[PDB]
Subunit: 121 residues, 4 copies
């Protein structure tokens, strides 16, 4: 985990994120998207639970990206929750929630759910 | 948002979290739980999209908590995605994803989904 | 369960559904909504697992509503997954997924997630 | 849709389901699983919204399976929400929610979320 998490990851839709896993569970980095009301790089921050593992389990982690930078303000944020699996073909399998700021009447339709798999290749 | 987000929040199951919303979209603080394989305070980190709003919309945000501290290591992490609504009865309405580290065979049953509403009272 | 499930249920946003729980796990009825690109009554069909319970557990169930009737065709469908709890204040607590038909490019943003609590009152 | 939906579908984990899409939005069939506290065939019932489409969109649908049959009673039910895409490589992309009957104290951890892609091959 940690060392193995640090680096560049890519998902099936063309997004990329670079992250550094800190010794004490922190995850800091940048996310550059391919889809959405996104344009360029956004700051990401998260945590991972290591001290993950004598039975080859994945390392649980999660991170958040607020979709605001100097070129775009999408009034939304996405959180990814999943686990890191290392080795030959290391990957981070996740499920995500994207919430957009709405008025109280439309709050019932403010959150989208999806999944993403990231690889080092 | 920000100023209004900073402070202590409580949810329906008895959990509490104290957070500081930084000028540039950061959210840092601690989460003390009431349920789970949790015991005491855990570090939380997240982001919010302000620059939220001429039509009274909520401010989108998200945060992560890795369930590891000096007393417990639950090998899991939770991410909350939702929005902040301020005023008299300010609240943060969220949906969350809790992923536990599993072996590849049980990865299909590694993530729980739920919702939480936090208030200042 | 079953007998206790049969009847009219109402949720916090003003929607109502009438359902009949059949002896062999079937759920059939109609849903009349309050929100969305919905207008009038829609057919609902689902299943419940009874034979639910010596430790006062809820009865798991789920149902689907395709949002098409003689007055509206929203090109979407919602599924609710949750459990029935009977007694004085019987309720059905659920989480739902609403998927809209999209082109392949927008499939990543086709599903909304939410929760609903239904009561007999 | 409908005609194209009728038939046998398989997912990445080895489960199979046979379904008949009825002229008026009904979906009826059987699901045979590969994973879980499942064993053999279970009844499935659902709905689809056709009258789906001059811009090649998918057809929204959803179905439910209560995990009880003559050999197993798992006290749980799963609902799948997604869309059907036809053609050469027709597929049904879905997100699912699996709720297990729990006591009120553990209701917060009663629902799992995941995704499944089904193909005709």
């Amino acid at each position: 985990a940690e060392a193995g998490i640090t680096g560049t990851w890519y998902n099936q839709l063309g997004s990329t994120f670079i992250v550094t896993a800190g010794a004490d569970g922190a995850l800091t980095g940048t996310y550059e998207s391919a889809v959405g009301n996104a344009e360029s790089r956004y700051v990401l921050t998260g945590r991972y639970d290591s001290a993950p593992a004598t039975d080859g389990s994945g390392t649980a982690l999660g991170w958040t990206v607020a979709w605001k930078n100097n070129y775009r303000n999408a009034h939304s944020a996405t959180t990814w929750s999943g686990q890191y699996v290392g080795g030959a073909e290391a990957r981070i399998n996740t499920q995500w929630l994207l919430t957009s700021g709405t008025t109280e009447a439309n709050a019932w339709k403010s959150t989208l759910v999806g999944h993403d798999t990231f690889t080092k290749v």
